């Protein structure tokens, strides 16, 4: 009966493909044929945060657009003040191998994780001075690649055992497990309403979940290699993904298909981070060729280069008010741009 | 100078800067090694010979020198994602089982393919390898009954230990093309008394070479 199920699956996929082709009338570019170009974007390095001793692997902005977490495998998780290049806490980690960091939207907790299969949650507002470990979530059988908060009492992570998890910090259990991927999931991003998120693994796909029940809603496949970064459009109806075939793609949600692809002949490297602006007109993508590029997010034409890094740019984040973009590379540094 | 109550904050910032600098200075005094291998490569035999889920880190000190051994064989996923976290290590310890007349595709062929892949990786283009060829006893017993030509058909020469081992070693060594790095070789027995000394000597030589190239004198 295996052949029968294979034939049924082939028929279902053919039906889905036919429906997707049918609903596609015209592409986004033709509708956006009239809007004027935004012109070259001049951006100069304002602050240069210089504290670490090894390659920075992740960052995350705060909610107030001023504080910033930085995680690097010198064993360090240090939080900064962007406006005055100051350090407010330094945290020594139990494990030196780190690939993720999160700053709670309430500012009370931070999270970290890496190859040692454990997501550690660090308190910040203790009554005894220093910051201490509150919980060590451990249910995964592979390395963590991303960790995002939802509120103070829960957390969402994605790990290299082809699965994702929603935890409960107070108890320590694993409130829900999402499975259905084929390879290593390496990115994660939450929609504004904190009700559904999209994750993209090394099997050239990105699937969208719902946090309440775990049933996968949609699978998007356009790429030709691993996807190493995902970010959302601000209104939660589109998202941008960055692969290792030198292209980044803007995908829709209601139209159930791909809208735009971004790639240039000069570019052959692989994307390590993708983000938007506040309005949703510019796309910022960091490359392995030691810089960052800005794409007109409705014209696909390149509109400037954020250059000045001496090695691969890994983390890239824009603030919650659109005032600056912070890029962090294996050069141990971290730069702010307007 | 226009600062008001932020003067404290800056004192705390320099205090934690001092702590970071001191921790870095104290933590640059430890050697970092990465232990690789193949299936049933005997890498469990030499990890226990050192006496004090996820990454298994073993710590030991010998002749007043820190060591750190990072077993990563517990990772069941794509290798090309987390190898780059192990750049800027001092050495890669590669263990190869000399029992080279079996199937898992001969085991030696898997070992050669893995060694070629890890030696021509872009990140480890200049990171040195200490090569252990384990099970030098069992191989000696087995060589009499079976010919080495079953593993490498091209081979022609004596069927003795002292030459078959050398041919295997040379076939392994012929996989490096960088002019800087080097492969250090040893043929540890199943239960030899002291082969931490070989690791000590190899790491001393690596440090000397790195110092010489850093000063520009090379």
């Amino acid at each position: 009966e295996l052949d029968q199920l294979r034939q049924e699956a082939e028929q279902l996929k053919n039906q889905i493909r036919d429906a997707r082709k049918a609903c596609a009338d015209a592409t986004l570019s033709q509708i956006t044929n009239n809007i004027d170009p935004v012109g070259r974007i001049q951006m100069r390095t304002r602050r240069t945060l210089r504290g670490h001793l090894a390659k920075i692997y992740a960052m995350h902005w705060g909610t107030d657009s001023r504080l910033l977490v930085s995680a690097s495998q010198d064993g360090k998780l240090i939080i900064w003040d962007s406006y005055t290049t100051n350090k407010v806490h330094a945290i020594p980690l139990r494990s030196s191998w780190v690939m993720t960091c999160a700053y709670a939207p309430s500012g009370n907790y931070v999270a970290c994780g890496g190859l040692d299969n454990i997501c550690s949650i660090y308190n910040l507002k203790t009554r005894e001075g220093n910051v201490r470990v509150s919980r060590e979530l451990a249910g995964h059988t592979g390395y963590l690649s991303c960790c995002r908060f939802l509120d103070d009492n829960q957390i969402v992570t994605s790990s290299g055992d082809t699965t994702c998890a929603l935890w409960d910090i107070e108890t320590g259990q694993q409130t829900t497990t999402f499975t259905g991927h084929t390879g290593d999931v390496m990115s994660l991003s939450l929609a504004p309403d904190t009700r559904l998120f999209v994750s993209g693994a090394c099997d050239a796909s990105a699937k969208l979940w719902d946090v309440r029940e775990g049933m996968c809603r949609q699978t998007f496949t356009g790429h030709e290699s691993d996807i190493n970064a995902i970010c959302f459009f601000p209104n939660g109806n589109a998202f941008a993904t960055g692969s290792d075939d030198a292209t980044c793609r803007l995908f829709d949600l209601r139209a159930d298909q791909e809208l735009m692809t971004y790639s240039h002949d000069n570019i052959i490297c692989g994307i390590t981070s993708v983000s938007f602006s506040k309005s949703g007109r510019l796309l910022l993508a960091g490359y392995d060729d030691f810089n960052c590029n800005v794409w007109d997010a409705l014209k696909a034409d390149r509109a400037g280069v954020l250059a000045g890094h001496d090695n691969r740019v890994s983390c890239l984040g824009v603030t919650d008010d659109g005032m600056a973009v912070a890029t962090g590379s294996w050069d141990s540094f971290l730069k702010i741009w307007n | 100078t226009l600062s008001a109550e932020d003067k404290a904050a800056v004192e705390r910032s320099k205090m934690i800067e001092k702590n970071l600098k001191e921790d870095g200075i104290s933590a640059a005094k430890d050697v970092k090694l990465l232990l690789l291998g193949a299936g049933e490569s005997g890498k469990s035999t030499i990890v226990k010979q050192m006496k004090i889920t996820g990454i298994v880190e073993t710590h030991f000190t010998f002749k007043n020198l820190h060591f750190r051994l990072f077993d990563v064989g517990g990772q069941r996923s794509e290798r090309k994602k987390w190898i780059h976290c192990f750049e800027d290590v001092t050495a890669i310890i590669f263990c190869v089982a000399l029992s080279g007349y079996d199937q898992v595709t001969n085991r030696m062929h898997e070992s050669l393919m893995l060694f070629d892949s890890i030696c021509n990786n872009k990140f480890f283009i200049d990171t040195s390898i200490i090569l252990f060829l384990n099970k030098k006893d069992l191989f000696g017993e087995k060589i009499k009954k079976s010919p080495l030509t079953i593993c490498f058909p091209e081979y022609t020469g004596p069927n003795t230990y002292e030459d078959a081992a050398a041919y295997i070693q040379a076939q392994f060594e012929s996989k490096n093309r960088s002019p800087n790095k080097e492969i250090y070789c040893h043929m540890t027995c199943a239960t030899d008394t002291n082969n931490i000394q070989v690791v000590f000597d190899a790491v001393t030589d690596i440090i000397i070479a790195n110092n010489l190239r850093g000063c520009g004198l090379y």
Partner: single-chain antibody
Amino acid sequence: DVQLVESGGGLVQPGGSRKLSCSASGFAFSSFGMHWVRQAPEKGLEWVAYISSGSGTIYYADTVKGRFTISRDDPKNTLFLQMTSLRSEDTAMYYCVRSIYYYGSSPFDFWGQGTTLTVSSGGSDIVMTQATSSVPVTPGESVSISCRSSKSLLHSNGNTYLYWFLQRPGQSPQLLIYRMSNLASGVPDRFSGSGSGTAFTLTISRLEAEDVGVYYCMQHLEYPLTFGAGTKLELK
């Protein structure tokens, strides 16, 4: 728990010398800054000395420089004040407070218990004036208290530095509001603050019977710290 307890008090004839020890338990003592604040039997709060984390910066009041000295022993977590060549203007009860500082911190969050010392017979300092001294109140009402400085407390950083303190009868003061708007930890929602530049006000809504005592305002723009005379509260 957090505990600060002081020792070294009693009675000394004029001219002598003593040493006061404040012992701490329950927190990372080495990462804080210690202060000293004294209180005359009838008057209000006055400032004595300040020592920082790492013992880099030490500050003294004008009426104390030269005579007294301060020290700390953080491996054995105890703070010290050495007093020499005393005077009759030192008969008072002394306190021990902690002042951790960083972006978003809360200074003066815990006050010690206080040691009593008595002695027998033998221009840019910012002045802050609390207007009213006695205000009768009734439970459930709303009361607004005032504090007017002499210099504008709004720095360029967008911050202003005025702290409010409450003192119940026969206990140590507790911090209510820090930086004119922030409500501290462990304090109810009733209290709130407002003001502008120099004229600063604190509002208590639906006053209960546990909030009787005396209230104070403090400045932290520049050293030395200057308090106010305080405003008392009484029922009926």
